[PDB]
Amino acid sequence: PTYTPKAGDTTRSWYVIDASDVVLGRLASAAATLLRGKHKPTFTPNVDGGDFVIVINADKIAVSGDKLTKKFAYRHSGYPGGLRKRTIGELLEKHPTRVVENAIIGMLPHNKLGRQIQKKLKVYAGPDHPHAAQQPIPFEIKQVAQ
Amino acid sequence: MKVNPSVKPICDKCRVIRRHGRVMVICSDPRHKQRQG
Amino acid sequence: ARKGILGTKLGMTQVFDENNKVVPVTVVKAGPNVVTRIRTTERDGYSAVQLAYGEISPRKVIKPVAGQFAAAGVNPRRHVAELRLDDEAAVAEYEVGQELTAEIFSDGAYVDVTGTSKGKGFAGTMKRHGFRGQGAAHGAQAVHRRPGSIGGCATPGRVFKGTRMSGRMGNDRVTTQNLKVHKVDAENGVLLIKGAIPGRNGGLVVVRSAIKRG
Amino acid sequence: SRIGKQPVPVPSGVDVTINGQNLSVKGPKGTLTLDVAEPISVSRAEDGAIVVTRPDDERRSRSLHGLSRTLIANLVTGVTEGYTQKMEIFGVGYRVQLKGQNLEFALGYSHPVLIEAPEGITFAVESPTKFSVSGIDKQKVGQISAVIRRLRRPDPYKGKGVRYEGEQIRRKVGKT
Amino acid sequence: AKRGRKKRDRKHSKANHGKRPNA
Amino acid sequence: RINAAARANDITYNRLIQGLKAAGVEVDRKNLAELAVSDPAAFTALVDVARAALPEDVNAPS
RNA sequence: GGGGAUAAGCUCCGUGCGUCGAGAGGGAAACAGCCCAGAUCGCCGGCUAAGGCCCCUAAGCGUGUGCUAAGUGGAAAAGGAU
RNA sequence: UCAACCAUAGACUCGGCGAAAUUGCACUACGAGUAAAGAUGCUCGUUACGCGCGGCAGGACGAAAAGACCCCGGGACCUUCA
RNA sequence: AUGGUUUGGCACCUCGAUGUCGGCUCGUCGCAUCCUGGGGCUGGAGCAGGUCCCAAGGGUUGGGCUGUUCGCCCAUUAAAGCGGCACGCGAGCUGGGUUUAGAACGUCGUGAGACAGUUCGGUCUCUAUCCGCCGCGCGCGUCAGAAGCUUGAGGAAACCUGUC
RNA sequence: ACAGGAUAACCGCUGAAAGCAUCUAAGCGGGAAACCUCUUCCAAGACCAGGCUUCUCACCCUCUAGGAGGGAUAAGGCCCCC
């Protein structure tokens, strides 16, 4: 029958993506792919068999057009008139990692397994990360050809 | 300034331009100033 | 700078100024406070000074607290509290073991007093939110103090969060701003502060320099 | 395009320097800098000049070509000759004086208007009703001179306000 | 009005082929 | 799973299926996935087979 | 085609026109009447339709030539518009 | 205006006895939508640790009463140059 | 052309019940801004305006008449905004009106009786299960157990204005 | 509140495309009770569940000693008590 992982088959690898001059959605799609495990042949949609994904230089993410000023990240407090919006530039200068996070989190499944997958995502605005002990492999975002 | 969808010249000095995504009309005579809106 | 101090509220009284105008003051036992820890950005991520106030027996102290006060290098106190500052240049003035008194302030200074409001218990919307009640006559069946409506109808279909309802009032941190100290009294170790102060008598307060008016 | 084709003649007292699109000029009046738009070719000619061209004919390149040429022209003529704007004042009581390097106007307000001189700019007062701004950047010069021009609301009924040297303001009449 | 407009313009989709129930 | 293993062998699922159908490999996707999990070398061999059987310009009408 | 304001998710007719009704399944975000297709049961086999192939989401961040700068796409008129 | 305070009976707490209407279910969120055109239950998202206590009454088109208004059908009683 | 607040058209949910006007209380939202704020043009001298644009942060009175909404009026005001939310809100209140049964006037009707005609009078039920909301606890967790002091992501509140 | 930042309408500077002109297409500025900061308050159930410190930082038993289970404790806390 068709393969299912059993309790020790989920191997974790650490990848690291330099988000310098990389397109936001491009990076986020790639990272969600790795975090979910679509790049793996052991992929089982009921399993977080994905890989850890570090993102560095999140502040240097590339955003096309006027999205830096006319795309808003909205948020609601639950209270009336509690809609607070903040552009992507405002968000980049305040909380740089939040744009990359939000992008990936939206590209991920909105479920309990998605929540479990978020934990493998580490995002850092500089070029440096503390997860060097884990020996992360650099991951260039390629495009398979045809 | 006049703000109307139909902005057009009023005299020979009124020049038409596209400024910041808006069709403006400029002139020495500031009465003839117009903007699309 | 924003120099400050912890103290105890003792009660209100009167004084008279040079113009023979009356000043309702509150007497704050701005007492011997002792510095017990310096908060820094290289250690704690923010600049602040930890003060301690209130005599206490060394047996009523929880032993962790005893160890904290010891490693600081002072004897224990009852209440401990931090004063946030703006920069390392502002925190560089406070040394551990340093003693703060009312004399850090001066007559005519404007202060902000942080205290803990008196408890009004489970309060109705009238006492708590200034709701007009309803009529005491003209037919009112048992709504003389009731809030009345609570939301819209089906279109909302819910009660909005943050609606003003009955519940516990008081025991909340209250900062009263821009109170002019009428007088310092270092002999007694108190401040005569023009006007109301939050909390009961014997309540702890924090008299800080006014963040608006110097 | 038609502006960008003619290069800029460099006088003697000039020291041009390039690392690619970037540009740094020096002259008697001071020094100046400019990072040229990428699609605009820049070269230092043999004939003591700075040639600037465009590879493509797209409207963006056609615009940036002429603009960059004008920018280098203003740059060199500012760092060699300087850029001046003479202003003058009209109306009774409407005056200016020099409080060091800053200026102080009286313009019928209840208070004096203190214009702080920014970096690179130097003011001067030929008279309480006639003054001037000088510098090396035409942009900053026009900027501060316009900040000065807009200090008072336009007064087309009696002309009370700041003007440029040869400015022909509009006017009206209030009869009643 | 907006609701009817949106519901009608939904029919201008590659799947619906310019027709929908109640248009 | 096939797409994953294929893109690990530097080929897309679609061109893999195309090449297998051109090579006359009637293997079903179940067994291809099982190979991808259990015999990646055999999967690579089939990928090579499919890449051979593909044309030289896949975006040409032929 | 009538009535209606050549409005109504309106009404009344016609149509070896359809579907729902009495019709599951796939697509249309969800969505009786639209598109595909008419479910005898089973299969951890394959090809397809409509529709789709960056991630959610299976399949293409497909190839080539151009266009678009408005996030147009991802609502709209007379009319305005180097 | 403009409401404040006091007591008492309840409400609250403890002990004891111990109902009720109601009830298709249930580990019963919010927004914008969609839908028998006003959604806890569908879609896309957002938010939300689990369980209680006191309270408020916006919704559950809440409970109650097979709408009395309207219409249809049938009665009853009343009137009269039926 | 917008909008969908008016009168309407349709009659699609609801007639084995979706309680109605107005007010009271509580609000919340939009901006098509009444004031405050910023500005362009003016047949804008100045005071004061007119018109248009931006702006919804806050504020936007009390009374006489009327059931009234609306409106008129009185005094004020910086201003006395327009609208939505089941013409917001009756398991929150009233019940003056409409809209039962009584009675009367006028009119109609032979009559019984009728009148978007008037008039006087005339039961407003419910111990809150769920969501929601206001507050308060219990449990567990935050990779030992505890304690003190804290950061502040993220939310809430506040944001008015005149006279001299 | 002051103050700052970024902005709306708007005022502009330098400037082409388009030998001029043009607030703009590259660039640079100014600019409102709106926005973000600032003020007050809640807040690490902020599941990235944080940080700075301090205290205890130690015993037995049973299963066959695998992973646990039970007990007694410390720091400390709770209950009773005022």
Swiss-Prot record, chain B:
- Gene Ontology cellular component? cytoplasm; ribonucleoprotein complex; ribosome
Q: Which GO terms describe its molecular function?
A: structural constituent of ribosome
Question: What's a BP term from Gene Ontology annotated to this protein?
Answer: translation
Q: Which UniProt keywords apply?
A: Ribonucleoprotein, Ribosomal protein
Record's superkingdom? Bacteria
Residue intervals passing through the bilayer: none
What is an example of a Pfam family matching this protein? Ribosomal_L36
The Swiss-Prot or TrEMBL record describes its family as follows:
Belongs to the bacterial ribosomal protein bL36 family.
**PANTHER family from the UniProt entry:** 50S RIBOSOMAL PROTEIN L36, CHLOROPLASTIC (PTHR42888), LARGE RIBOSOMAL SUBUNIT PROTEIN BL36C (PTHR42888:SF1)
Q: Which NCBIfam families does the annotation name?
A: rpmJ_bact
Extract the HAMAP family matched here. Answer: Ribosomal_bL36 (MF_00251)
- Name the record gives this protein: Large ribosomal subunit protein bL36
- The organism encoding this protein is Mycolicibacterium smegmatis (strain ATCC 700084 / mc(2)155) (Mycobacterium smegmatis)
Curated annotation (Swiss-Prot), chain C:
Q: Which domain of life is it from?
A: Bacteria
Q: PANTHER family of this UniProt entry?
A: 50S RIBOSOMAL PROTEIN L3, LARGE RIBOSOMAL SUBUNIT PROTEIN UL3C
What biological-process GO terms show up in the record?
translation
The protein depicted here goes by the name: Large ribosomal subunit protein uL3
Q: Is the keyword Metal-binding in the record? A: no
Q: Which GO terms describe its molecular function?
A: rRNA binding; structural constituent of ribosome
The membrane spanning regions, by residue number, are none
From Swiss-Prot, chain D:
Q: Note the Gene3D superfamilies from the entry.
A: Ribosomal protein L6, alpha-beta domain
Q: Molecular function terms in GO for this entry? A: rRNA binding; structural constituent of ribosome
Q: Which domain of life is it from?
A: Bacteria
Give each disulfide bond as a residue pair. Answer: none
Which UniProt keywords are given for this protein, alphabetically ordered? Ribonucleoprotein, Ribosomal protein, RNA-binding, rRNA-binding
Q: Which GO cellular component terms, listed alphabetically, does the Swiss-Prot or TrEMBL entry include?
A: cytosolic large ribosomal subunit
Question: Which GO annotations describe the biological process of this protein?
Answer: cytoplasmic translation
Similarity comment: family membership: Belongs to the universal ribosomal protein uL6 family.
HAMAP family, sorted: Ribosomal_uL6_B (MF_01365_B)
Q: Assembly and partners?
A: Part of the 50S ribosomal subunit.
- Please describe what this protein does: This protein binds to the 23S rRNA, and is important in its secondary structure. It is located near the subunit interface in the base of the L7/L12 stalk, and near the tRNA binding site of the peptidyltransferase center.
Q: What is this protein called?
A: Large ribosomal subunit protein uL6
Record the organism.
Mycolicibacterium smegmatis (strain ATCC 700084 / mc(2)155)
This chain is encoded by the gene named: rplF
Curated annotation (Swiss-Prot), chain F:
Q: Which residues of the full protein are shown?
A: 64 to 125 of 129
Tell me the organism. Answer: Mycolicibacterium smegmatis (strain ATCC 700084 / mc(2)155)
For this chain, the annotated S-S bridges are none
Would you say which domain of life the source belongs to?
Answer: Bacteria
> Encoded by which gene?
rplT
Give the UniProt family note: Belongs to the bacterial ribosomal protein bL20 family.
> Where does the sequence pass through the membrane?
none
The protein's job, in short, is:
Binds directly to 23S ribosomal RNA and is necessary for the in vitro assembly process of the 50S ribosomal subunit. It is not involved in the protein synthesizing functions of that subunit.
Question: Protein name, please?
Answer: Large ribosomal subunit protein bL20
